[PDB]
């Protein structure tokens, strides 16, 4: 039970494949995000009305072409882990990597000529 | 009247000539201010006080200095990373998991 | 573009960990190659 244990470090519960079905049927799953290198794992976030409140569950998906209609029929909101904001930061990083070489060579030249003449050893 | 009129013309054109170069002279004056701060006696006093502070701090931090210079990577993090990385690759044999390492 | 977008899309501050890991391992690959060559 929940009443006979210490609260410890919020983590992801695990549903098998079936209580996920019943839960998304009863209208309780609220949002779903797909992940996995082969796109067959689900992280599902429930809604407050469910028995147990909002939790974050994990499900493993074995190919089933009825899934999408079931989800979209019951008001579930699918999601992808990318916002224009994130892509726009990746673009910024690519541009920095583009510029890093010429700046590196001009810094190298400047420090060569600095060490060589305009600030040498004293004698 | 005429010569002071020519002087008035040179004065107005001097106004224009002074203003057209104002960003350049602005950066120049800012640079002059910057490099003026760093040859006083006040800056020398600061440098010497910082020297004393560094000396005091170095006499109290010998164990941590040796730890971060000689021990952190070479004898704590590198062998752990190496063993974990080797065991990540290298199939679940015995010659490869235990005997060759 | 495609490399970085793919490692963003697949796997909070986790994208930053993955990107730093990517850049670090690439530079280390090039350096190890050069040193091992020059060691003959």
């Amino acid at each position: 039970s929940v009443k006979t244990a210490w609260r410890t470090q919020e983590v992801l519960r695990e549903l098998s494949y079936t209580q996920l079905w019943a839960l998304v049927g009863e209208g309780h799953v609220a949002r779903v995000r797909f992940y996995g290198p082969e796109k067959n794992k689900v992280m599902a976030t429930t809604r407050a009305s469910a028995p147990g409140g909002e939790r974050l569950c994990k499900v493993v998906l074995p190919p089933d072409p009825e899934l999408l209609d079931h989800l979209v029929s019951n008001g579930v909101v699918v999601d992808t882990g990318v916002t224009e904001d994130d892509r726009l930061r990746a673009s910024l990083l690519v541009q920095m990597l583009r510029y890093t070489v010429p700046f590196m060579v001009i810094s190298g030249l400047f420090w060569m000529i600095h060490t060589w003449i305009l600030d040498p050893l004293p004698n | 009247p005429l010569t002071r009129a020519v002087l008035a013309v040179v004065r107005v054109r001097e106004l224009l000539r002074a203003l057209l170069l104002l960003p350049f002279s602005a950066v120049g004056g800012a640079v002059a201010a910057w490099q003026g701060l760093f040859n006083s006696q006040r800056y020398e006093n600061f440098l010497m006080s910082e020297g004393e502070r560094i000396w005091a701090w170095r006499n109290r931090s010998e164990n941590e200095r040796w730890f971060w210079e000689v021990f952190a990577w070479d004898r704590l993090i590198f062998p752990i990373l190496v063993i974990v990385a080797w065991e990540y690759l290298v199939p679940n044999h015995l010659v490869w998991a235990v005997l060759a390492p | 573009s495609a490399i970085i977008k793919s490692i963003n899309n697949k796997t909070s501050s986790e994208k930053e960990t993955m990107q730093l890991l990517l850049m670090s391992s690439s530079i280390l690959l090039h350096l190890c190659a050069i040193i091992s060559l020059v060691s003959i």
Binding site: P37 | - | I3, S6, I7, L21, L22, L29
Partner: peptide, 15 residues
Amino acid sequence: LALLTPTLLTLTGQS
């Protein structure tokens, strides 16, 4: 680079 290889193997179309 073997950690990211499942991720980077979508740029080729395989698993």
